[PDB]
Design a protein around this nucleic acid. Structure first.
Ligand SMILES: Nc1ccn([C@H]2C[C@H](O)[C@@H](COP(=O)(O)OP(=O)(O)OP(=O)(O)O)O2)c(=O)n1
Ligand SMILES: Nc1ccn([C@H]2C[C@H](O)[C@@H](COP(=O)(O)OP(=O)(O)OP(=O)(O)O)O2)c(=O)n1
Ligand SMILES: [Mg+2]
Ligand SMILES: [Mg+2]
Ligand SMILES: [Mg+2]
Ligand SMILES: [Mg+2]
Lengths: 372, 372
DNA sequence: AGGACCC
DNA sequence: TAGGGTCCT
DNA sequence: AGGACCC
DNA sequence: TAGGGTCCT
């Protein structure tokens, strides 16, 4: 039944990687730019009002002294992101990734094995490592407190190792499920860790200011919950299970309502190798509709290099697009087809499929999937 | 590279099972009825003009002395169909099912292991078991002939065992890929077997009278191939790879054209346990739209009994429908939702999901999928 | 194919 | 206003 | 969700 | 004109 889960969430991930590559960017406010977006910035920059995902413009008139490096090519972020995951897999094999810089790890077996190693005595010497959310008092006779503390120690070891082995700093959150571990990992933001004891669960959940902040409720469900009067986490908690049930479906409803309480049973799943490999190119206005094929070969050349290296081969290929007038707020199109078996065991053939796949049809991408 | 594949295809499967249950139906022309459809009939009935999938009416004015048993409930056909597959898995583990009464088995490893058991002498005594398609002469110095013959013998053993162990008769086809093995299994129809030597491949493929007859080309691609002038297997063979490529997609095109030649690389896949469990009920006009919920509980009661017995549990549930005016030639609708985790470890809850799933929405069905 | 959600 | 990624319907 | 194909 | 089933987009 009761779990100890850690969420590890690195500091300003892309910026960190670029500050390690070029030390002269440390102590300078640094943004990482992709097109006209400053996708992230180091903490010197955020002191100056730069926020995650500003446009460049907004960001250099909040802070004109900002250095920008291009981060369009994710290769090095991707590589560091797998080094991180593989280090954490060493502590416990079941690591779930979320984007390039978050991992969840179910520490439940590891905590219990450390607890049985202690003799009935040093158990009163168990302390916490890091902060305790809401400054809550620990009760060393509460078996759950104890386990969560041991879980804070495992966390501190994982962060130390990330630092010593890969040069990376990060936050960690320790709690009894993934939702709470992830909410509590951000309470002390820069390169620290927090542990949630069960008595403070409602305080954390109610510290949120809109239901969008609950992992699991996105841009669309939020706009829905509103249209009904449901604005705070408490409105969602107290709202009618029925009317909700019959509006968002039985699945989305009964789940998001659980979450509004801090309750989340989802297991930490082994992410292992990726299920897809894609790259992309943005260029607003530039795809005449054929001129831009030389674009399709570029995407291919990288992708083949990557897909290769893994071992596994993809058995499906896909092509994706969008097109331009006023804000069509969601609108990409794709054509999918198997990859013929003779080609699986090079470029030149891969480029055709992708053109014809372009004919059954701002910006362009290729995706390899269905790996084996 | 070169394979020996067998396709096993049982005689009038449902009728066989009902003639074994009630011996008094043997030697009588027997049809198995589902609603107004005689889905299949034993060979005494087909002498009298009864064909597979006639309406009852048509079928009893071609042969008014026809006995009919109801076959709406597939339980016993399903059970016999897994006994068959599991027997064939005993000869070689990789057995692919197709519907309830066809299996493919890749005999390639088994043939080669029997060949290395023979000393360089009794290899000239290898004979065939069953017919040889097109009455083709065997060449005992042709390693491919030899292997195919040994493959005919394995086939005869599998059919004998099916008979001795389960009481069932069937045809088998032996050839170098699945397409050809399946085409050649029907040449000698009632309870016999045929083997295809490579020199006669084109004769078999050209013996077909319309491209619909090629496994792989269905009701829709056929209507397409027509709209273009492609009517015979030879028209498909000689038609332009390009114009085809750019009309049915690169995938459907390059594959169906291979097939038109007798070429088919698809591997025999291990079907193992099912990926879904459903039942259905037809009743044309009867679903007022709620009255008919008592229908939804009936489907559930069986399904739960089955899903159970396997071991594995389903994590998804689905509900399916159609509705009625003139011939909407395809038109079923479904609502899917996860099954909550507390319910996975009974009826009563399963009935609700399925109603609400009915509200987001002739005939009705429930499907359990996503087993684990 | 496309939707919805995440970083 | 990027460039990726996951699983569900 | 629905399409297409198979028995 | 049944009652099932598989995998792809
Ligand atoms: N919409 C998004 C979200 C994030 N990222 C990228 C840039 C980030 O460096 C990285 C990790 O996302 P985080 O929300 O973790 O942001 P940071 O690690 O950069 O900031 P923090 O220190 O607040 O955790 O993924 C992105 O490209 N697009
Ligand atoms: N459209 C279909 C096709 C078949 N079946 C069922 C009834 C059959 O008994 C069984 C196997 O299908 P076959 O084409 O193999 O038909 P038979 O085994 O009945 O006839 P045969 O002796 O020609 O192989 O599946 C069905 O219900 N609906
Ligand atoms: Mg993060
Ligand atoms: Mg981060
Ligand atoms: Mg058959
Ligand atoms: Mg049959």
């Amino acid at each position: 039944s009761s779990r100890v889960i850690v969420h590890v969430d690195l500091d300003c991930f892309y910026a960190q990687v670029e500050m390690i590559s070029n030390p002269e960017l440390k102590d300078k406010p640094l943004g990482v730019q992709q097109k006209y977006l400053v996708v992230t910035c180091n903490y010197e920059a955020r002191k100056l009002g730069v926020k995650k995902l500003m446009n460049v413009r907004d960001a250099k008139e909040k802070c004109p002294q900002l250095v920008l490096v291009n981060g369009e090519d994710l290769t090095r972020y991707r590589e560091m992101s797998y080094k991180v995951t593989e280090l954490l897999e060493e502590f416990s094999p079941v690591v779930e990734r979320l984007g390039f810089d978050e991992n969840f790890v179910d520490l439940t077996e590891m905590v219990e094995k450390r607890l049985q190693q202690l003799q009935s005595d040093e158990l009163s010497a168990v302390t916490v490592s890091g902060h305790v959310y809401n400054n809550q008092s620990i009760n060393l006779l509460d078996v759950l407190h104890i386990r969560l503390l041991v879980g804070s120690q495992i966390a501190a070891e994982m962060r130390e190792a990330m630092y010593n082995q890969l040069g990376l700093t990060g936050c960690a959150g320790v709690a009894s499920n993934k939702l709470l571990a992830k909410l509590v990992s951000g309470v002390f933001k820069p390169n620290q860790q927090t542990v949630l004891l069960p008595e403070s669960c409602q305080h954390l959940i109610h510290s949120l200011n809109h239901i969008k902040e609950i992992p699991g409720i996105g841009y669309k469900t939020a706009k829905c919950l509103e249209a009904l009067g449901i604005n705070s986490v408490r409105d969602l908690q107290t709202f009618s299970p029925k009317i909700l049930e019959k509006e968002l479906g039985i699945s989305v409803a009964q789940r998001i309502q659980k979450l509004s309480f801090g309750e989340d049973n989802s297991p930490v799943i082994l992410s292992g190798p990726p299920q897809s490999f894609s790259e992309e190119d943005s260029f607003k206005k530039c795809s005449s509709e054929v001129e831009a094929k030389n674009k399709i070969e570029e995407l291919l050349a990288s992708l083949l290099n990557r897909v290769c290296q893994d071992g596994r081969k993809p058995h499906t290929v896909r092509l994706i697009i969008r097109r331009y007038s006023s804000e069509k707020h969601y609108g990409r199109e794709s054509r999918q087809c198997p990859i013929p078996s003779h080609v699986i065991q090079v470029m030149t053939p891969m480029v055709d499929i992708l053109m014809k796949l372009f004919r059954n049809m701002t910006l362009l991408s290729v995706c390899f999937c269905n790996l084996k």
